[PDB]
Design a protein around this ligand. Structure first.
Ligand SMILES: [Zn+2]
Lengths: 48, 358, 80, 76
């Protein structure tokens, strides 16, 4: 949530449910892996 | 009432501060001053006027004002005497047509006679145009620096009948008088279009579909006006444009005030729920008169059922369709009031032109 | 075959300033060039010739159309 | 202006009245009233994660020529 008052704040959704759940008061952050639950911008945290 | 506010006039002058420009001008043309005719830029501010009237003035000045051309009478291009093989009649006629002239007399006939008595590729300039007709020119009607076509060695080109042809820039573009240089609405706020978030927009803070600007700035440029008569030339142009628009609106009024004798230009129908539909057709009319009529009718009848026009590129005509909840006489008198309103505002514009520029 | 009498797009009479512009441009190129043959001028990677100030001194406004058709139109006398 | 049909009646609108686009499309479609309800090509699931679709544009609905939902695009 771009604003600091929209209490849901973080929403993790599937592509189909995006239009059902997300509105204009939100912005997209890095994606999430659906197998190992790692953030796209947190891939570097994994050990090579 | 001052519809037409202050107006800035600025001729386009040659800057002899550049060494290259001065050297070139003195080297070929022996030019040490500004040219006899200069292209002037005229920027005008209008207040309390509909966009349709300002744009109609702009369009009329652009092409619809009767303007003069230099042209070649058929047979003037002497096929026998013109030796040069590269200077076709079409090319030289095209070069001579688009020389912007400021002609006060229509009987001036010019002639071209250029013989290349040498081994160099001689270039014909506008100073080679010799006038033999009408009153002797005490001031040139075109700059003497225009490049008419060159000549190969030993070749000659003779054109004996170059006259002044009257026309409007719509039919042929060589009659175009003014070129636009600015147009902006002064009452509508504008975004800082330099920013990324607004670069894709027009900049105005209101949509075109909802805006009704009433304060404009129309900037026009005239291609050649005499250097010591700039203001008088500009006034002549503006007054002529207003006169043309008034004349065309009055031509439409002529058929408007003839609600009987069903001339094949006005057809009136009373249909369905006592509604009146009026269709006006004028052949060889443009978006100027159509948009003016539509705007002023819609001003006069804000709750009109439908007023609209269409200038289809083919059929070369304006068809204005007015539908209103009134009898035929009532609709005709309201539309006549609208036409008189157009006439009145353009007379006001002419008077303000005279008051302002002088 | 020559610089047009008026700008094709808008009709501003650039043809007035043409004949002056050819010679002025030639003179300016003469100074801005170096050890480079004329046929190699459009090949120099260390050569930059801006005619903005020259055309402005000619009185031609900041119009894309007029400047384009002034600086780009080919001259037949130069090639034939 | 340029549809060549019989122009509709705007006598009920003030000069400052703001007409919606769906409104004028409906005033055209009422001449041949039909029923249509379908998602528009403007709405695609592949785009959906990025850009915020207006919920009033991802479903096109026409009832007896009254277009009141969505946009008109290739699908419609
Ligand atoms: Zn131009």
């Amino acid at each position: 949530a771009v604003d600091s008052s929209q209490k849901p704040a973080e929403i993790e959704v599937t592509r189909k449910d995006v239009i059902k759940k997300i509105d204009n008061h939100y912005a997209l952050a890095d994606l999430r892996c659906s197998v190992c639950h790692v953030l796209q911008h947190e891939v570097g945290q994994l050990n090579i | 009432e001052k519809i037409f506010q202050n107006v800035e006039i600025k001729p386009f002058l040659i800057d002899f501060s550049n060494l290259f420009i001065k050297n070139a001008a003195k080297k070929l043309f022996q030019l040490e001053e500004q040219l006899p005719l200069v292209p002037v830029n005229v920027v005008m501010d209008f207040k309390g006027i509909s966009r349709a009237a300002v744009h109609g003035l702009s369009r009329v000045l652009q092409d619809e004002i009767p303007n003069y051309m230099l042209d070649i009478k058929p047979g003037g291009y002497k096929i026998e005497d013109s030796t040069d093989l590269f200077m076709t009649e079409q090319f030289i006629r095209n070069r001579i047509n688009f020389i912007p002239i400021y002609a006060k007399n229509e009987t001036l006939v010019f002639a071209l006679r250029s013989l290349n008595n040498s081994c160099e590729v001689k270039t014909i300039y506008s100073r080679d145009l010799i006038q033999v007709a009408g009153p002797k020119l005490k001031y040139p009607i075109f700059n003497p620096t225009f490049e008419i076509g060159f000549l190969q060695p030993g070749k000659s080109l003779i054109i004996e009948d170059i006259y002044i042809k009257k026309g409007i820039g719509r039919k042929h573009a060589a009659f175009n008088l003014a070129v636009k240089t600015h147009f902006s609405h002064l009452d509508i706020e504008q975004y800082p279009t330099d920013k990324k978030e607004y670069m894709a927009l027009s900049g105005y803070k209101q949509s075109s579909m909802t805006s009704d600007p009433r304060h404009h700035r129309l900037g026009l440029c005239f291609p050649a006006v005499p250097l010591p008569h700039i203001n008088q030339a500009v006034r002549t142009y503006l007054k002529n444009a207003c006169r043309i628009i008034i004349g065309r609106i009055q031509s439409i009024q002529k058929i408007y005030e003839n609600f009987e004798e069903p001339q094949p230009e006005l057809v009136l129908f009373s249909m369905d729920e006592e509604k009146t539909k009026a269709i006006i057709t004028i052949k060889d009319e443009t978006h100027t008169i159509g948009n003016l009529l539509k705007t002023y009718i819609y001003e006069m009848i804000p709750d009109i059922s439908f007023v609209g026009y269409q200038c289809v590129p083919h059929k070369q005509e304006m068809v204005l369709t007015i539908i209103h909840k009134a009898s035929q006489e009532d609709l005709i008198t309201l539309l006549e009031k609208s036409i008189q309103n157009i006439i009145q505002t353009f007379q006001i514009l002419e008077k303000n032109v005279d008051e302002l520029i002088a | 075959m020559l610089i047009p009498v008026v700008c094709f797009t808008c009709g501003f009479p650039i043809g007035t300033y043409a004949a002056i512009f050819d010679k002025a441009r030639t003179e300016y190129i003469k100074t801005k060039m170096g050890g480079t043959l004329p046929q190699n001028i459009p090949l120099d990677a260390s050569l930059q010739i801006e005619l903005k100030d020259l055309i402005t001194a000619l009185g031609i406004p900041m119009r894309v159309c007029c400047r384009t058709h002034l600086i780009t139109t080919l001259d037949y006398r130069k090639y034939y | 202006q340029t549809t060549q049909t019989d122009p509709p009646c705007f006598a009920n609108y003030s000069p400052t009245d703001l007409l919606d686009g769906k409104s004028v499309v409906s005033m055209l479609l009422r001449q041949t009233p039909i029923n249509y309800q379908r998602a528009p090509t403007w709405y695609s699931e592949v785009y959906a994660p990025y850009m915020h679709y207006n919920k009033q544009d991802i479903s096109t609905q026409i009832r007896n020529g009254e277009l009141i939902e969505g946009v008109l695009d290739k699908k419609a």
